[PDB]
């Protein structure tokens, strides 16, 4: 019933190898360094706090706030997230290749690293759509989901299966609710997985 | 006496989960991206080496040296540290929230990654104080400690316990000695842990 030292070493080494491969071992076709980009935020309003002041020699220069581009960058230390006003938001992403989308990942910080002890700014209900071109107003539904505030930091979601599989190079993420924060919603990272067209 | 494969997998997965949470699984109220900031270095002198020259088309542009802000940023590759002249230094940090401080973390690179084989620039004796406002000259002692050059890279230190627990949003780190480097002392990362006031 019990394992040997050699077998324990193999299990440890295999787990660290997967960890080192962006945690998942799967291509992220939204990743900015790999060819993904942010096209649009529609009518979303980036939350303007006016608290992060950059200065030199005592001279005020600029107020700093995070860009929507941080959602397709891998750092997820607290605060490395895009914040929009209210709890409804929109993000249009161009993928690095034309693919058949099969799954999506959403990450948020865990409660143990949040200074208040809660993650009420995290997204709750959301959906993903496939678009044929940047200017399409309503795309094809790829799935509707809920990010669970009592789950793990990284959560994965499976796309709907249809008898005809259409390929897309643009997707739209829509956030419909958050976990109760009354001023804003924060998005740390969104990933898109699937199979490239041959 | 022996463990099963299922039990070994659970131990491995739990260790990687803690590792991914900033190694410790505890909020760092000094972290810059999360709301902390560097207010002052008092009379400390940043070490001026004049060796890192930035150029374009062969035209010299700027000499590069690290900012005190790197002490509240998480990268700790060799050289990603703040260096001050001599072995006495001062750093005044504003926390992201008002808290009851309970513990502090100090990190330095390990000897195996230092090109000389020693870490003589690391801090040795130090203390932490709580301040009521930025312009206070002498704060309340929260503890005095020694970073052990023969210990682990990341070391944690417990604050003094008093019958009345006062809350602070500003702390001061004072370094009194180093591990023998004759020109400078290098600080890689300093963290502050505790419980936020309700």
């Amino acid at each position: 019933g019990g394992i040997t030292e050699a077998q324990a070493r193999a299990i440890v080494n295999s787990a660290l190898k997967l960890y080192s491969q962006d945690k998942t071992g799967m291509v992220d076709f939204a990743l900015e360094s790999g060819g993904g980009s942010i096209l649009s935020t529609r009518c979303s309003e980036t939350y303007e706090t006016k608290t992060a002041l950059m200065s030199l020699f005592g001279i005020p220069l600029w107020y700093f706030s995070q860009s929507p581009r941080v959602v397709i960058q891998p750092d997820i230390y607290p605060g490395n997230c895009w914040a929009f006003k209210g709890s409804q938001g929109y993000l249009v992403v161009r993928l690095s290749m034309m693919i058949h989308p099969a799954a999506f990942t959403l990450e948020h910080i865990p409660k143990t690293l949040s200074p208040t002890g809660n993650i009420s700014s995290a997204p709750k209900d959301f959906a993903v759509y496939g678009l044929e071109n940047e200017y399409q107003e309503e795309g094809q539904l790829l799935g509707q989901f809920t990010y669970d505030q009592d789950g793990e930091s990284l959560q994965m979601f499976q796309a709907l299966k249809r008898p005809d599989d259409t390929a897309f190079q643009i997707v739209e993420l829509r956030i419909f609710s958050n976990w109760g924060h009354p001023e804003y919603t924060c998005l740390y990272r969104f990933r898109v997985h699937g199979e490239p067209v041959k | 006496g022996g463990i099963t494969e299922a039990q070994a997998r659970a131990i491995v997965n739990s260790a990687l989960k803690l590792y991914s949470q900033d190694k410790t699984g505890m909020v760092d109220f000094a972290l810059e991206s999360g709301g902390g900031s560097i207010l002052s270095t008092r009379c400390s002198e940043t070490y001026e080496t004049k060796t890192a020259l930035m150029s374009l088309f062969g035209i010299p542009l700027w000499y590069f040296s690290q900012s005190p802000r790197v002490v509240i940023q998480p990268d700790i590759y060799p050289g990603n540290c703040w260096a001050f002249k001599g072995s006495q230094g001062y750093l005044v940090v504003r926390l992201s929230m008002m808290i009851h401080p309970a513990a502090f973390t100090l990190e330095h690179i390990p000897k195996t990654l230092s090109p000389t084989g020693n870490i003589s620039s690391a801090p040795k004796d130090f203390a932490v104080y709580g301040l009521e406002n930025e312009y206070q000259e002498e704060g309340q002692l929260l503890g005095q400690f020694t970073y052990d050059q023969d210990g682990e890279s990341l070391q944690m230190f417990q604050a003094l316990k008093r019958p009345d627990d006062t809350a602070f949003q500003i702390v001061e780190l004072r370094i009194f000695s180093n591990w023998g480097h004759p020109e400078y002392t290098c600080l890689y990362r300093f963290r502050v842990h505790g419980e936020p006031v309700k």
């Binding site: 939350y47 706090t49 006016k50 608290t51 992060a52 002041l53 950059m54 200065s55 030199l56 020699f57 005592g58 220069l61 700093f64 706030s65 995070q66 607290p78 605060g79 997230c81 914040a83 910080i109 949040s114 200074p115 700014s121 804003y184 924060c186 | 810059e32 999360g34 709301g35 902390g36 900031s37 560097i38 207010l39 002052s40 270095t41 008092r42 009379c43 400390s44 002198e45 940043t46 900012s67 005190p68 802000r69 001062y90 504003r94 992201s96 929230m97 000259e137 002498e138």
Partner: peptide, 29 residues
């Protein structure tokens, strides 16, 4: 005295390293 002058000083504020100060509110997170 030297001990009294050090408290007065803030060499980081008169350097070429830009400062980032949170004016009384944590950023979104």
């Amino acid at each position: 005295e030297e001990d009294y002058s050090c408290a007065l000083s803030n060499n980081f504020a008169r350097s070429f390293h830009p400062m980032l100060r949170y004016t009384n509110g944590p950023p979104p997170l």
